[PDB]
A paper describes a structure:
The structures of JEV SA14 and SA14-14-2 E protein are highly similar to those of other flaviviruses. Architecturally, all of them consist of three domains, Domain I (DI, yellow), Domain II (DII, red) and Domain III (DIII, dark blue).
Interestingly, the side chain of JEV SA14 Lys279 protrudes to the bulk solvent whereas that of JEV SA14-14-2 Met279 is directed to the protein interior. Accordingly, JEV SA14-14-2 monomer provides a plausible dimer (complexation significance score (CSS), 1.00) with a nearly two-fold axis while JEV SA14 monomer cannot pack to a reliable dimer (CSS, 0.00). The three elongated DII domains are tightly packed in JEV SA14 trimers and separately arranged in JEV SA14-14-2 trimers. Only in the compact JEV SA14 trimer assembly, the three conserved residues Trp101, Leu107 and Phe108 of the fusion loop form a bowl-like hydrophobic cavity.
Residue numbers in the entry: 0 to 401
Amino acid sequence: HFNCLGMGNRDFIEGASGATWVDLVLEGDSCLTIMANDKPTLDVRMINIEASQLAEVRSYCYHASVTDISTVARCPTTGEAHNEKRADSSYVCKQGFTDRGWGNGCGLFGKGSIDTCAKFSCTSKAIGRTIQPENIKYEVGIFVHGTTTSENHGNYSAQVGASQAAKFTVTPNAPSITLKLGDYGEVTLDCEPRSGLNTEAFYVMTVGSKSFLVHREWFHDLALPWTSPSSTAWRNRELLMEFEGAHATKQSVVALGSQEGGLHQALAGAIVVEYSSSVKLTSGHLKCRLKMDKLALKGTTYGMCTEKFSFAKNPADTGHGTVVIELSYSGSDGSCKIPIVSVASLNDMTPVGRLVTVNPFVATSSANSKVLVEMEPPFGDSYIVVGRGDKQINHHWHKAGS
């Protein structure tokens, strides 16, 4: 998806009268149509963002498993108990004391030392990763509103074969690019990619099948056990475990409940990203300058088409205050310019609309060729009028207000 027709989110920019630069902000779910006097109309849209080489930072356990409990006890005054599970890193251990006497195995009375261990296993974890900024790629599409049909308007191969479209990537290393556009000229797009998706504010956090963009702030004060690529064991395991009251030589150890639910109140509540060895997202923005001084019109030279047109597709509402039609030209004198205006009444044929497809034309000498035309009609009732004199055709159009 590289141009605007059919997109549900669309914005219209009026380039200044005679300006050589145009500032843009490309919304990742949107499309810009830029119009300016004496210039062909352009669509530009941010297609997606891409980051490839993600480093790992830290993982959090939100559901722990407590298994294989064991206690070593000692009689009062005989020293500190040492449980040998302390030589095993997957065990968490805590010292303690219990009441001891003749009734539970000791010859003296008083506090006897105990050492209780339990195995800590992680059952499900949220793993966070980092994007280095040198590895973000913005995919951007550009389209110039030349001759198109209903079928090929969104076909990328057709439009790039007619030199009317380009997909290109901008990176922090290559923030500018010039593309040629056939006899329409060229445009240069100068972007700001490191200040588009600020990779220093965020982590990518994979939870099960999905991943998210999370504030590093929130990711750091997660009161959960954690690991990192180089660490030997889970750390701070104890905030998912309860050492229960010790009695003689026994002590119970349980895990707390899963925090899986409590992790989904956050991330509600966060930007989803597609993750498959490389992270893809369409949400986001890119700030660009578009240079248009070497962009010029093609057409103007040509004569007007002489023969009758017909409506190959009746006008349809595009959803953004414009209507799109497809014409069929019965004539053979192409290449010729299409006579198409928007009039408010058929007796007062003063033009009142405005063409989005500026300078629409039939490119070929073949008869019954099809041309698509996008127009911005005035509010209320109007007519789309194609052709002159007895070759003329019209279609009523209504554009509602509210």
